[PDB]
Amino acid sequence: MSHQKIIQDLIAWIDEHIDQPLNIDVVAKKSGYSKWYLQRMFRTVTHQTLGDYIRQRRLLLAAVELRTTERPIFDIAMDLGYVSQQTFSRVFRRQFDRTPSDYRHRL
DNA sequence: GATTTGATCGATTGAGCCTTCCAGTCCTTCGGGACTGGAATTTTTTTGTTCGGAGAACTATAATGGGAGCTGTCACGGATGCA
Numbered sequence: 001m002s003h004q005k006i007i008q009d010l011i012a013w014i015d016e017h018i019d020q021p022l023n024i025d026v027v028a029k030k031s032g033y034s035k036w037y038l039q040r041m042f043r044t045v046t047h048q049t050l051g052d053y054i055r056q057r058r059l060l061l062a063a064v065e066l067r068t069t070e071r072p073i074f075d076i077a078m079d080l081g082y083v084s085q086q087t088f089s090r091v092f093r094r095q096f097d098r099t100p101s102d103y104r105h106r107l
Numbered sequence: 108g109a110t111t112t113g114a115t116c117g118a119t120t121g122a123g124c125c126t127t128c129c130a131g132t133c134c135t136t137c138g139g140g141a142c143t144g145g146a147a148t149t150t151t152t153t154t155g156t157t158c159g160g161a162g163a164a165c166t167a168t169a170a171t172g173g174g175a176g177c178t179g180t181c182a183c184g185g186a187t188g189c190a
Contacts, residue, residue, distance in 0.1 A: 001128085023117095024117085024118090025117095035117090035118080036118070039118065039119080039120075040120070040121090043119085043120070049119065049120095051117075051118060051119080052119090072108095073108080074108095085108085086110080086111095089108095089109070089110085090110085093110095099108095099109060099110095100108090100109090101108060101109065102109090
């Protein structure tokens with residue numbers, strides 16, 4: 001099996017258990033690889049970060065789960081990768097130049 | 108609820124550490140799928156012998172008419188063949 005098939009399955013791996021408390025080290029058990037072999041191969045194809053990749057969409061899916069539902073932000077930290085809200089809001093201001101609170105108020 | 112700061116898990120990746128994925132080439136080895144001579148075997152028809160079989164003429168005292176066990180009791184009738 002060539003390597004361009006695996007990252008097609010690696011992105012067919014991730015988007016189904018984002019509401020789960022998921023990490024990179026369980027991907028390496030499911031893909032059988034080591035913990036380090038995931039992060040070299042993503043740069044030949046995407047030229048982005050795969051360590052922050054599973055952390056990017058826990059903003060992007062909390063950009064619709066907070067947006068559609070009436071969920072408050074202090075349960076997003078304990079499940080979607082963090083421990084407190086003071087770090088979750090900072091990753092948003094580097095990505096899309098916004099704060100989480102005034103992200104919904106903009107119709 | 109929005110942000111400011113210290114260090115540390117992870118690992119931005121960079122090199123550095125190690126055999127297999129598999130086209131099938133080829134190998135010496137060997138009984139199968141090619142039909143075969145030659146040698147054995149067994150009938151399958153063929154040849155022949157011969158004992159019984161079986162067909163056949165002849166048998167010269169004189170012998171000159173059978174019945175031979177039948178039909179033991181249906182009676183009514185419809186045409187018949189005489190008369």
